[PDB]
Amino acid sequence: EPTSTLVRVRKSAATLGIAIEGGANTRQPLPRIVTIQRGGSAHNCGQLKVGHVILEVNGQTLRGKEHKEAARIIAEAFKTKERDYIDFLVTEF
């Protein structure tokens, strides 16, 4: 029934290059990508597209996380030197 896909984003630029909306209490219960900036790390990936709903980031689920906290997880996952990547479990729903 559900449809997930894992997109791994390599860090080829200084910026992530995405914009997200939603979280807990919002009309969009899960963070949804609205813009993908040209030149950014996300733009090089290609597979990541606008409208994709992010369920998990590096294994951590965004279900139940408020927009503020959801943004905190993604920003920290990009700033971190542990990985040279950022795993996203995204959906078409």
Partner: peptide
């Protein structure tokens, strides 16, 4: 009355 949007 809010409509959040975070840029990275």
């Amino acid at each position: 009355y809010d409509d959040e949007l975070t840029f990275f």
